[PDB]
Write a protein that binds this ligand. Structure first.
Ligand code: NA
Ligand code: NA
Ligand code: NA
Ligand code: NA
Lengths: 409, 204
């Protein structure tokens, strides 16, 4: 607990850019693209007010558009006077992917007609399309093969406080070890994490900070409408914050909270506000109505685990269950606790043989061990219980591919 | 119940079945079969024939059956085991785990076939486990899969009885003969014997 992330002060003018969304749609062969930027403002509306959105590829200005506030007609009462949408054409855009993280810079200027700048915001733009079609997860029209890993924000000395050096160290090790995807288990990450993923190139699964694993049954809260408001904020505020990051290709409703009605509502909410990214969730059986992706955790390759109500079918078998058509990407697999990862090769032989088996995220990146000191003041890695903490789960907090200090296992 | 239509020897295999001029001859082999056996309850599936590739004539006749008799699924293996002329994925000799990515008409591992993008049909091998001579090795592998995968609903072993013919020696004693034993040439010798039982029905 505590104030574990940054604290800062931001000054904004009264008339300000209060929000902006960036979308990139393409033609059949991705040789043409349209960048759509919706800008929202707060403060007093004046006719002289303007918004200019310009697109930059390095130091070269690719495109620019300007318009006063006032959107199209929405309904019987009109439209948003306090909003404006700028559309920009881009010929042969350099597409974004984990393979080649091509990025553009979008600058949003709030200014007066005479050209006086009021304020400006901006973000990195990655031209890529994510869509599920005929059962496959496609990135720019190509079927992905997720070589991902689950990663908690953990430091052996600083606990759950993240710093750039560590984020970069993790990112370099991941890419150096052929990983192209990371899942934010199980909450929105420190903001810098998304910037690095956009620039270094990693497919990200952004996950809402919702986990009620300890309840009985697991969905006791998620199925309760009285907890819908609290849950919605955890999902809605995540989207409002990271929706402009191209590295985010999938939204997650959270983790291990069974399956409740609140999940279906929030699932539909996202699809409605952001059709650019698939939505997934493992609770309630990995294939409920709240997920566009069959995303089981620890489902084996050939062996079925017929647990009542929430069985973990062999992934090969799961795909062909009567009526099933969705792609299957394990949100978690190959539990790397201690001397582990035995049988890893079996998963990859299946991923490559089956088109709809599109990889998964290993559990997990780094041991959640902590640093303690003995009488002589020498450091030693501690785990559950080594703090008087009780009850606890001992060493189950260590299931990483690397040690807490990043030395590889 | 299968129509009497096989043009295996053609090159390509669908040369006659994709030819509108052979449609008349083909439709009779299909239409007259249905008019004769449509009342038997034991018949649960209509088959458009065997090894004749996949031609437009297969589609027309497939649609004909679906029209005159909507009580039975229609299947046909030609052209890839999963064309538009079959309600059932019915490959012949597709293996349980190993793919055989032949060009145009591959034989995928049956487990994989079921889940190819967009596929939703049940899969029943029209031919599998070739019982030629000392064979049936790996048979148990098929049944483990059939029982584990709901959409893998079995198959038809190939085949029941060796097609050997009786011949007699100078002492008038009988012996089992096969391809070429009657001066018949060219022939394919013993490939006519692929059964689980001998021609006299003695078990293998
Ligand atoms: Na695959
Ligand atoms: Na654990
Ligand atoms: Na079955
Ligand atoms: Na034969």
């Amino acid at each position: 607990s505590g104030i574990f992330r940054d604290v800062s002060l931001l000054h904004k003018p009264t008339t300000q850019i209060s929000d902006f969304h960036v979308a990139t749609r393409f033609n059949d062969d991705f040789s043409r693209a349209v960048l759509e930027a919706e800008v929202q403002m707060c403060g007093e509306l004046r006719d002289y007010l303007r918004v200019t959105v310009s697109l930059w590829q390095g130091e070269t200005q690719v495109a620019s558009g300007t318009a006063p506030f006032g959107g199209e007609i929405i309904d019987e009462r009109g439209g948003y006077a306090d909003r404006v949408t700028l559309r920009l054409n881009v010929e042969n855009p350099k597409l974004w992917s984990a393979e080649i993280p091509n990025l553009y810079r979008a600058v949003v200027e709030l200014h007066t007609a005479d050209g006086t700048l009021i304020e400006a915001e901006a973000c990195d733009v990655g031209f890529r399309e994510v869509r599920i079609e005929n059962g496959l997860l496609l990135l720019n029209g190509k079927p992905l093969l997720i070589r991902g890993v689950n990663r908690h924000e953990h430091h052996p000395l600083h606990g759950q406080v993240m710093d750039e050096q560590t984020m970069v160290q993790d990112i370099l090790l991941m890419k150096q070890n052929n990983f192209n995807a990371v899942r934010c288990s199980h909450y929105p990450n420190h903001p810098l994490w998304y910037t690095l993923c956009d620039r270094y190139g990693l497919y990200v699964v952004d996950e809402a900070n919702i986990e009620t694993h300890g309840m009985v049954p697991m969905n006791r809260l998620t199925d309760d409408p009285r907890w819908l408001p609290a849950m919605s904020e955890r999902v809605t505020r995540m989207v409002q914050r990271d929706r402009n990051h191209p590295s985010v290709i999938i939204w997650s409703l959270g983790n291990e909270s069974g399956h409740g009605a609140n999940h279906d509502a929030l699932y539909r909410w996202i699809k409605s506000v952001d059709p650019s990214r698939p939505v997934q969730y493992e609770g309630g059986g990995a294939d409920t109505t709240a997920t566009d992706i069959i995303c089981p955790m620890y489902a084996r390759v050939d062996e079925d685990q017929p647990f009542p109500a929430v069985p973990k079918w062999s992934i090969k078998k799961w795909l062909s269950l009567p009526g099933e058509t969705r792609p299957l990407i394990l949100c978690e697999y190959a539990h790397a606790m201690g001397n582990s990862l035995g049988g890893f090769a079996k998963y990859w032989q299946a991923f490559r043989q089956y088109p709809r088996l599109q990889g998964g995220f290993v559990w997990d990146w780094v041991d959640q061990s902590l640093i303690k000191y003995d009488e002589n003041g020498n450091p030693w890695s501690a785990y559950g219980g080594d703090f008087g903490d009780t009850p606890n789960d001992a060493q189950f907090c260590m299931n990483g591919l690397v040690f807490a200090d990043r030395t590889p296992h």
